[PDB]
Amino acid sequence: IKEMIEDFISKGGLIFTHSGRYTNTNNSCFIFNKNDIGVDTKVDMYTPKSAGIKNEEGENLWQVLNKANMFYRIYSGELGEELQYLLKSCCTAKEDVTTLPQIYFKNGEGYDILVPIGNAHNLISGTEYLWEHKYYNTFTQKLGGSNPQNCTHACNKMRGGFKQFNCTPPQVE
Amino acid sequence: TKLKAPAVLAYSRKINPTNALMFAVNWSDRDNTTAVMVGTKTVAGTQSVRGNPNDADKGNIQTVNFANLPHNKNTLLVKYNVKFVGDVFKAELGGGEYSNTLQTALENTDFGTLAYRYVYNIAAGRTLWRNRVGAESIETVITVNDQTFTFSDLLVNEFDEDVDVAEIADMVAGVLSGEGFVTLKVEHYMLLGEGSEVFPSQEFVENSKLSKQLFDLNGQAAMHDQKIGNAIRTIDTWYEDATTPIAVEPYGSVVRNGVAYRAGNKTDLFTLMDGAVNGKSLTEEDQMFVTANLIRGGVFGG
Amino acid sequence: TKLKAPAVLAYSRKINPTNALMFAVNWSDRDNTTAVMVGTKTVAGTQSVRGNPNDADKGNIQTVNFANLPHNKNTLLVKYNVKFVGDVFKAELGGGEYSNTLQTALENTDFGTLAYRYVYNIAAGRTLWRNRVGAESIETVITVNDQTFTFSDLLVNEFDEDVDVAEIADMVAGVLSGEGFVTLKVEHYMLLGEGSEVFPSQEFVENSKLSKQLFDLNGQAAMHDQKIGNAIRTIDTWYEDATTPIAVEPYGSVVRNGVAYRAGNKTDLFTLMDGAVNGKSLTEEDQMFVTANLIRGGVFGG
Amino acid sequence: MRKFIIVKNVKVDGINAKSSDITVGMPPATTFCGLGETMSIKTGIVVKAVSYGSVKFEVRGSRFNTSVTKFAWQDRGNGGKANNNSPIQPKPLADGVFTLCFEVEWEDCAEVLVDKVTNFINTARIAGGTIASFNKPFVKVAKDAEELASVKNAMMPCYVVVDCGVEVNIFEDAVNRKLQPMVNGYKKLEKIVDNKHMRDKFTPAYLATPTYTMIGYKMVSNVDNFDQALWQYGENTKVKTIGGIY
DNA sequence: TAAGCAAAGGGTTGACGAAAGCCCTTTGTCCCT
DNA sequence: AGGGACAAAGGGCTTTCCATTTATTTA
């Protein structure tokens, strides 16, 4: 693990639980919110042109950190400060508002500008929960186009694409 | 060699019989054809099964279709046309190389005898089957390009030799051995008597709606065209222990008796046709069978 | 060096045939057009495969869709509209220097004999594919822009020269060589014999009860539009060992025979284009093949 | 004295179905509750609550894949990269026939409210959609539940949306109960340090994440309470229901 | 009311790539003789 | 007083890194 984490910090080195990369690939906005991360929550991963080194079985950094709270046992801190501090040096905040939706909300006596950006856990728990447990009403999408590995490593890993729900009500006869 | 028949090889019909309609005429008044209609009558029978004998004390009711002659008419008419269309050796699907060596292996088949037996079933009346029984005298009239030939009742099984069958058979042999087509507008006439029950082909019901659904065409009783085609091709007397003529089949199948006459003992189609294309010479009776089944049709591909 | 087709080069249809309809008429009177309809009958034949010789005594049963001329009429009528559209070379999808270098290298083709073979295929009635057989005489009438013509006999395999196809060939050749469209409303009359069998186009059935379902518009027998447009363009006589006029395709491929007549010998359309854009001299009888495939359609990929 | 104004059988066309990367199809209740603020700011009529049904709805595409137009080349930095088709990121669109109910207080004759919402329909867009045909609006007055049932019987036929609430979390609830989630509120994450890239340059801007809820599609002739079907602004940066959870 | 409801042959291909790196050019900024 | 250097800033082109389930499936 140490050599490819060192390769990651020598690379671009960004981990995130929230992004706008899924809305448009020209996003480059990245924030790791802290209080929403629970034991089964999942996190995606970006480095430039989705590069990396395998762990001698074709295994990159993602399923490593994703597999059953692997990240948690370094985040809670039972693996020592030596790995935990180098992990914490990667989760930085990167701000960008270009080519993103920018909407308003009525707050108390006034309006507030805010940018909707996507969630990390929702896509991966969607691919692993509407699929395995027999929900038979969904749309399968692939982002991006013929080269989907431009966004993230989550984008890179599965090429079947994520799943949304159908929002089609039954209609009047 | 080993030209294995094309994965999909199929031969089209070279005999096109029509849906044989049934009519009611008189023996002297042969022109006033009363159209026999399929009626619907309900039937209170009994359970007759060779198991669980305790159900016989309780009856049962099913609704059938029936076709009866009108009481003022004592003869039934069967109208159909049979179109003998040539080029029996070119397939429809497949049809390439395998069929060409079949063509150059079958230029000496006795098409005269084939045409004679193919029109003998009309000359008698294999088509009728059940309408043939209980008939005082069958009379079939064949019209072909301004040449009307009346026949009586040729004994079905044994193929007798005469002159009036042979002229139409010469026309059919001139059609099947070359190019073109011929048409026989064929009318069967049988004295079944006043009102006796006649037997069209029977269609297919749903799960439970009718016990016996006769083949109706605008409410008129009619025979199936493939039933007529079974009748025309009932010529096969070349299997082992040849007792009675059956329909020419690739396996020699008689489904009503449940016996495979030619299957599994080299006398099926796919062995002596593969031998024909591989270069093994045939007799005068197997090659005429193989071209007769080419006139029959089907698919020949594994 | 080389110019290549654009990754995407799509060529839209320059023939738009409508899906033909099948009607029943008499021969002497053609005004009482009564729809030949798709009816659902059931056959009870034989289990006869090239393999499985054990299953040769158990009868199979499927429901098939059948279409016949009704037993009061003796002529099949086939009605369709065919729109020969112009703007032949303009690439619908794609279209730069492989659409325009093709224009400067393909402006001197023979559109006249192209249109003659297309209007001959309609006029000789090769558009029926099965109803030609068992027909005494065919009468194909074509109406273009308020003028009507009638065709009796044309041997279809050899494209003969006459005077009543040739002026329609001038109209169609003028409408492909420039802009616009010409509409042929065509009616085919076939005296098939009294009450004979017609043959509509079968649909694909994906795991259905019907083993044979014909094409259907509003309960009535019909043939596929792409089947008609297949049989307009059976004009290809410039391949290896030139023989039958087969349908024109980029590999000269008939899928019934399972053999492509223009593939693998440097004769295919694709090949016959990269030299043309590169500037080689195309001969007189294969640039017409290229233009016939321009007016067919297809994708011209990378 | 409350007033109801009704937009019936409005044909929306070009409406982008991507409510989120996980919910696609209908736009969220933030859209149809911000429509009220849109007519509160553009026109001036105060809208306090909103409810919506669906006469018809269809998302553009096939049965398991709905998808997106070929994108344009409307970016700087792609000078030689214009001969190719596009960079295509997913943005599915839809088309639907809708019914809309707005809670407004007017204190004036009803012959001005109809025209004042009519000229606002012609200039606004329904989540990127284009209004094709819409019925003439009419003003309804209800003072109790009995006269609110007169509002209930006149939207026949439509399929209204009521809140249903989450049990524990999203996809689990979407599985065992087989219901439908959609976005009902937004959670502030981080404040952008510079406002030179904003569209307003004065209001502070925070990044947001979509919070979801479960709903129910109900026949409008079978709902007990319309206030269970109305939606309004909530706290903080959320929407809710007058009638609560159904 | 009872007994039995076929086989092969194929099922398209073409566009749909953001960010790091590497050179090339241009024009803010400064210079004297 | 103005071309020439000093260097930032755009801009075209050039790799690149991928490997999971290819869904099944409709009310």
Automatic annotation (TrEMBL), chain A:
What is this protein identified as? Uncharacterized protein
**Organism field:** Vibrio phage ICP1_2004_A
From TrEMBL, chains B, C:
- Top-level lineage group: Viruses
Q: Which protein is depicted? A: Uncharacterized protein
Organism equals Vibrio phage ICP1_2004_A
Automatic annotation (TrEMBL), chain D:
| Official protein name in the record | Uncharacterized protein
What species is this protein from?
Vibrio phage ICP1_2004_A
